[PDB]
Design an enzyme around this catalytic site. Structure first.
Site, PDB file in Angstrom:
ATOM      1  N   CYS A 224       3.601 -13.844  -3.968  1.00 50.26           N
ATOM      2  CA  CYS A 224       2.931 -12.647  -3.480  1.00 50.26           C
ATOM      3  C   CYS A 224       3.900 -11.490  -3.318  1.00 50.26           C
ATOM      4  O   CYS A 224       5.039 -11.677  -2.892  1.00 50.26           O
ATOM      5  CB  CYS A 224       2.257 -12.935  -2.135  1.00 50.26           C
ATOM      6  SG  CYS A 224       1.433 -11.497  -1.403  1.00 50.26           S
TER       7      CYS A 224
ATOM      8  N   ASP B 141      -0.649 -13.316  -6.117  1.00 54.34           N
ATOM      9  CA  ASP B 141      -1.345 -12.278  -5.369  1.00 54.34           C
ATOM     10  C   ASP B 141      -0.329 -11.146  -5.385  1.00 54.34           C
ATOM     11  O   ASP B 141       0.433 -10.959  -4.439  1.00 54.34           O
ATOM     12  CB  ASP B 141      -1.628 -12.722  -3.934  1.00 54.34           C
ATOM     13  CG  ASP B 141      -2.694 -11.874  -3.264  1.00 54.34           C
ATOM     14  OD1 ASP B 141      -2.489 -10.648  -3.126  1.00 54.34           O
ATOM     15  OD2 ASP B 141      -3.742 -12.435  -2.878  1.00 54.34           O
TER      16      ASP B 141
ATOM     17  N   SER C   6      -3.563  -7.943   2.217  1.00 50.97           N
ATOM     18  CA  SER C   6      -3.627  -9.397   2.238  1.00 50.97           C
ATOM     19  C   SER C   6      -3.710  -9.850   3.687  1.00 50.97           C
ATOM     20  O   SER C   6      -2.802  -9.588   4.477  1.00 50.97           O
ATOM     21  CB  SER C   6      -2.383  -9.975   1.570  1.00 50.97           C
ATOM     22  OG  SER C   6      -2.286  -9.509   0.238  1.00 50.97           O
TER      23      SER C   6
HETATM   24  C1  FAD Z   1      -5.082  -7.019  -3.766  1.00 44.88           C
HETATM   25  C2  FAD Z   1      -4.100  -6.092  -3.042  1.00 44.88           C
HETATM   26  C3  FAD Z   1      -3.458  -6.511  -1.831  1.00 44.88           C
HETATM   27  C4  FAD Z   1      -2.521  -5.661  -1.110  1.00 44.88           C
HETATM   28  N1  FAD Z   1      -1.969  -6.178   0.057  1.00 44.88           N
HETATM   29  C5  FAD Z   1      -1.073  -5.335   0.723  1.00 44.88           C
HETATM   30  C6  FAD Z   1      -0.487  -5.847   1.951  1.00 44.88           C
HETATM   31  O1  FAD Z   1      -0.727  -6.954   2.454  1.00 44.88           O
HETATM   32  N2  FAD Z   1       0.429  -4.949   2.584  1.00 44.88           N
HETATM   33  C7  FAD Z   1       0.799  -3.701   2.174  1.00 44.88           C
HETATM   34  O2  FAD Z   1       1.605  -2.986   2.768  1.00 44.88           O
HETATM   35  N3  FAD Z   1       0.223  -3.235   1.027  1.00 44.88           N
HETATM   36  C8  FAD Z   1      -0.689  -3.991   0.292  1.00 44.88           C
HETATM   37  N4  FAD Z   1      -1.270  -3.489  -0.873  1.00 44.88           N
HETATM   38  C9  FAD Z   1      -0.867  -2.088  -1.246  1.00 44.88           C
HETATM   39  C10 FAD Z   1      -2.064  -1.373  -0.415  1.00 44.88           C
HETATM   40  O3  FAD Z   1      -3.445  -1.630  -0.907  1.00 44.88           O
HETATM   41  C11 FAD Z   1      -1.865   0.206  -0.571  1.00 44.88           C
HETATM   42  O4  FAD Z   1      -1.699   0.594  -1.959  1.00 44.88           O
HETATM   43  C12 FAD Z   1      -0.666   0.795   0.190  1.00 44.88           C
HETATM   44  O5  FAD Z   1      -0.812   0.411   1.573  1.00 44.88           O
HETATM   45  C13 FAD Z   1      -0.568   2.233   0.100  1.00 44.88           C
HETATM   46  O6  FAD Z   1      -1.745   2.940   0.497  1.00 44.88           O
HETATM   47  P1  FAD Z   1      -1.770   4.314   1.102  1.00 44.88           P
HETATM   48  O7  FAD Z   1      -3.205   4.622   1.306  1.00 44.88           O
HETATM   49  O8  FAD Z   1      -0.960   4.443   2.353  1.00 44.88           O
HETATM   50  O9  FAD Z   1      -1.101   5.109  -0.099  1.00 44.88           O
HETATM   51  P2  FAD Z   1      -1.851   6.066  -1.022  1.00 44.88           P
HETATM   52  O10 FAD Z   1      -2.297   7.312  -0.322  1.00 44.88           O
HETATM   53  O11 FAD Z   1      -2.915   5.349  -1.771  1.00 44.88           O
HETATM   54  O12 FAD Z   1      -0.772   6.471  -1.978  1.00 44.88           O
HETATM   55  C14 FAD Z   1      -0.092   5.543  -2.849  1.00 44.88           C
HETATM   56  C15 FAD Z   1       0.544   6.227  -4.052  1.00 44.88           C
HETATM   57  O13 FAD Z   1       1.601   7.080  -3.562  1.00 44.88           O
HETATM   58  C16 FAD Z   1       2.674   7.110  -4.531  1.00 44.88           C
HETATM   59  N5  FAD Z   1       3.944   6.738  -3.835  1.00 44.88           N
HETATM   60  C17 FAD Z   1       4.271   5.775  -2.883  1.00 44.88           C
HETATM   61  N6  FAD Z   1       5.602   5.776  -2.495  1.00 44.88           N
HETATM   62  C18 FAD Z   1       6.133   6.797  -3.249  1.00 44.88           C
HETATM   63  C19 FAD Z   1       7.459   7.377  -3.373  1.00 44.88           C
HETATM   64  N7  FAD Z   1       8.532   6.923  -2.650  1.00 44.88           N
HETATM   65  N8  FAD Z   1       7.568   8.433  -4.282  1.00 44.88           N
HETATM   66  C20 FAD Z   1       6.588   8.978  -5.058  1.00 44.88           C
HETATM   67  N9  FAD Z   1       5.296   8.514  -5.025  1.00 44.88           N
HETATM   68  C21 FAD Z   1       5.123   7.410  -4.092  1.00 44.88           C
HETATM   69  C22 FAD Z   1       2.252   6.207  -5.713  1.00 44.88           C
HETATM   70  O14 FAD Z   1       1.724   7.001  -6.828  1.00 44.88           O
HETATM   71  C23 FAD Z   1       1.263   5.284  -5.024  1.00 44.88           C
HETATM   72  O15 FAD Z   1       0.380   4.783  -6.021  1.00 44.88           O
HETATM   73  C24 FAD Z   1      -2.232  -4.314  -1.661  1.00 44.88           C
HETATM   74  C25 FAD Z   1      -2.882  -3.897  -2.882  1.00 44.88           C
HETATM   75  C26 FAD Z   1      -3.777  -4.732  -3.555  1.00 44.88           C
HETATM   76  C27 FAD Z   1      -4.392  -4.160  -4.836  1.00 44.88           C
END
Ligand code: FAD
Ligand code: NAP
Length: 433
Positions: free
Chosen positions: A385, A430, A215
Site C-alpha cells: 500500500c 492498494d 484507506s
Molecule cells: C483508493 C485511494 C486511497 C487513498 N488513501 C489515502 C490515505 O489513506 N491517506 C492519504 O493521505 N491519502 C490517500 N489518498 C490520496 C487522497 O485521496 C488525496 O488525493 C490526498 O489526500 C490529497 O487530496 P487533497 O484534497 O488535499 O488534494 P487536492 O486538492 O485534490 O490536490 C491534489 C493535487 O495537488 C497537486 N500537488 C500535491 N502536492 C504538490 C506539490 N508539492 N507540488 C505541486 N502540485 C502538488 C497534484 O496535482 C495533486 O494531484 C488515496 C487515494 C486513492 C485513490
C-alpha cells in the site's frame, strides 16, 4: 452556453441547497441507508497530529458512524465530500464583484436533457463555490478559451487566448504558466486583473468538486462505530509565489471535534478487495511506507484483537518506512505496543533519511529474503500500500528477485509465480498517486 441563469430573489429557505450532494435536506435529515448519494455526516471525535516534526502535517482522524448502520472491513476505503476554504471563496466573490449570497438555478437550455443543472439547484453562488465546484486545480484550456472574452485589457485577452490555443508556443505557455505554476482560478483572475467574467458563467465552466478517498485505518472488529483516517496534508509554495492547499486534507485538518457544535464530515464507504486472509492462522506480510501504513493499522488492530479473544493467529509482519524516526514515524507508539504484545511479529522500519543514502522497505525485504520465502511458500498473503509511481513497482521487483533466487527459478518463472499469487488473492495492492 449550456445553461441559463434564473435568479431566485424570493425563495423559501427550505427549498435551497446548502451543500448536499443528493436529495435536498438529506445532510440535515439523516436517514439510512447511507451511501454515495446519501452520505452519512460523521462527527469527528478525534483529530490529532501523528508526526513528531514540523516539516509536514500528518494526521489521524476518527469519524463517529454510530447509528449509521454502515458496515466496513479493514482494507475498505472511506470517501469524503470536502468543502473549499471559505476565505478563498470570499476572495473569488470579491475580485469578481459578485454577491455570493444570491440564490439561483442554472438550467439546461436543452429542456429534454437529463442533466438539468450543473450541480444541485437552487443554491447560492457561495454554496456552489464551497461544496460543488473545483476552484483549486489548474483550469483546463477550454475554460481559458471561454474566459478570454471577459478580459478587457487586450494584452490579457491575447494571453488567455494564446494559452487556450493549439499553437506551439501557446501549449508551452499553458504548460508553464497554468499547469506547472499550479495557477488556480483565483490566481489567474489576480494575474489578469482585467478578467471580469460573470459569476454564473464561471460556475458553468468549472469542474465539480470530487469525493476524495482514504484507506480506512481501523478494524471494524475493534471500532465498529468509528472509521479512522491517516492522511498527509497537502500544502506547498507555487512557482508563482502562492501557497496552494489540498482541498480535502486542509478541510479535514480544520475539523475541530469541538461553543459546542460537532465537526461533521459527509462520508460513505467504498468496498475494496483488499482483505486479511479468511483464516487468522494464515501469515501476512504488509509493506506500506508513509501514509501507506494506513490500512495496516487496521489489519494489526484486527490481528491483535483476535489474539486477545483467544484465537490462534499466524505471523504478522510489517515493513514500514519514513524519513526520520523523530520526524514522521506514524503510529510509532501504537506499533511499538503491538510489537511488544506479540500482535506484530516483526516491525521492520526503513528510515530513508537517517543516513547519507536511501534505505527503503525493499532493502529490508531483500535482507529478510530467507524468512519471506519460507512464509510465501507456506501460503502467506502479501499486501502493498502507498505510492504507485515507484514504490509499488520497486517492491514487486524485489519479490520477483526473492522468488527467483530462493525459489531457484528463472526471472520469467518468478514473474509467473507472483502473478499467480495475485490471481489467487495472495498478493494485493492498494496504491495511489
Ligand atoms: C483508493 C485511494 C486511497 C487513498 N488513501 C489515502 C490515505 O489513506 N491517506 C492519504 O493521505 N491519502 C490517500 N489518498 C490520496 C487522497 O485521496 C488525496 O488525493 C490526498 O489526500 C490529497 O487530496 P487533497 O484534497 O488535499 O488534494 P487536492 O486538492 O485534490 O490536490 C491534489 C493535487 O495537488 C497537486 N500537488 C500535491 N502536492 C504538490 C506539490 N508539492 N507540488 C505541486 N502540485 C502538488 C497534484 O496535482 C495533486 O494531484 C488515496 C487515494 C486513492 C485513490
Ligand atoms: O505518505 P507520503 O506519500 O507523504 O510518503 P513519503 O513521506 O513521501 O514517503 C514515505 C517513505 O517512502 C520512501 N520512499 C520514497 N520513494 C520510495 C521508493 N521508490 N520505494 C520505497 N520507498 C520510497 C520515502 O523516502 P524519501 O522521501 O527519503 O525518498 C519515505 O521514507
Amino acid at each position: 452556453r449550456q445553461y441559463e441563469l434564473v435568479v431566485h430573489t424570493d425563495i423559501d429557505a427550505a427549498k435551497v441547497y446548502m451543500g448536499e450532494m443528493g436529495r435536498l435536506k438529506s445532510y440535515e435529515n439523516q436517514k439510512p441507508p447511507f451511501d454515495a448519494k446519501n452520505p452519512f455526516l460523521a462527527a469527528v471525535t478525534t483529530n490529532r497530529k501523528l508526526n513528531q516534526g514540523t516539516e509536514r502535517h500528518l494526521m489521524h482522524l476518527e469519524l463517529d458512524i454510530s447509528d449509521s448502520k454502515i458496515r466496513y472491513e479493514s482494507g475498505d476505503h472511506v470517501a469524503v465530500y470536502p468543502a473549499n476554504d471559505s476565505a478563498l471563496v470570499n476572495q473569488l466573490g470579491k475580485i469578481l464583484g459578485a454577491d455570493l449570497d444570491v440564490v439561483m438555478s442554472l438550467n439546461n437550455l436543452d429542456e429534454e436533457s437529463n442533466k438539468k443543472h450543473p450541480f444541485p439547484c437552487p443554491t447560492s453562488y457561495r454554496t456552489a463555490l464551497t461544496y460543488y465546484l473545483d476552484i483549486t486545480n489548474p483550469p483546463r484550456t477550454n475554460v481559458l478559451y471561454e474566459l478570454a472574452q471577459y478580459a478587457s485589457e487586450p494584452s490579457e485577452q491575447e494571453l488567455l487566448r494564446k494559452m487556450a490555443s493549439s499553437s506551439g508556443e501557446g501549449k508551452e505557455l499553458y504548460l508553464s504558466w497554468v499547469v506547472e505554476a499550479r495557477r488556480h482560478i483565483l490566481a489567474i483572475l489576480q494575474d489578469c486583473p482585467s478578467l471580469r467574467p460573470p459569476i454564473d458563467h464561471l460556475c458553468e465552466l468549472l469542474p465539480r468538486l470530487q469525493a476524495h478517498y482514504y484507506s480506512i485505518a481501523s478494524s471494524s472488529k475493534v471500532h465498529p462505530n468509528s472509521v479512522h483516517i491517516c492522511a498527509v496534508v497537502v500544502e506547498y509554495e507555487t512557482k508563482a509565489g502562492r501557497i496552494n492547499k489540498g482541498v480535502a486534507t486542509n478541510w479535514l485538518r480544520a475539523k475541530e471535534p469541538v461553543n459546542g457544535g460537532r465537526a461533521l464530515v459527509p462520508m460513505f464507504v467504498r468496498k475494496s478487495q483488499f482483505r486479511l486472509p479468511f483464516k487468522a492462522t494464515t501469515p501476512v506480510i504488509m509493506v506500506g511506507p508513509g501514509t501507506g501504513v494506513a490500512p495496516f493499522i487496521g489489519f494489526i488492530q484486527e490481528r491483535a484483537w483476535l489474539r486477545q479473544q483467544g484465537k490462534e493467529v499466524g505471523e504478522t509482519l510489517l515493513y514500514y518506512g519514513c524519513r526520520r524516526s523523530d520526524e514522521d514515524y506514524l503510529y510509532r507508539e501504537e506499533l511499538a505496543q503491538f510489537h511488544r504484545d506479540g500482535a506484530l511479529t516483526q516491525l521492520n522500519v526503513a528510515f530513508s533519511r537517517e543516513q547519507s543514502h536511501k534505505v527503503y522497505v525493499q532493502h529490508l525485504l531483500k535482507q529478510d529474503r530467507e524468512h519471506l520465502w519460507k512464509l510465501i511458500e507456506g501460503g502467506a498473503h502479501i499486501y502493498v500500500c502507498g505510492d504507485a509511481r515507484n514504490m509499488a513497482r520497486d517492491v514487486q521487483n524485489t519479490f520477483y528477485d526473492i522468488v527467483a533466487e530462493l525459489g531457484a527459478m528463472e526471472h520469467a518463472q518468478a514473474v509467473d509465480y507472483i502473478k499467480k499469487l495475485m490471481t489467487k488473492g495472495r498478493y494485493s495492492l492498494d496504491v495511489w498517486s
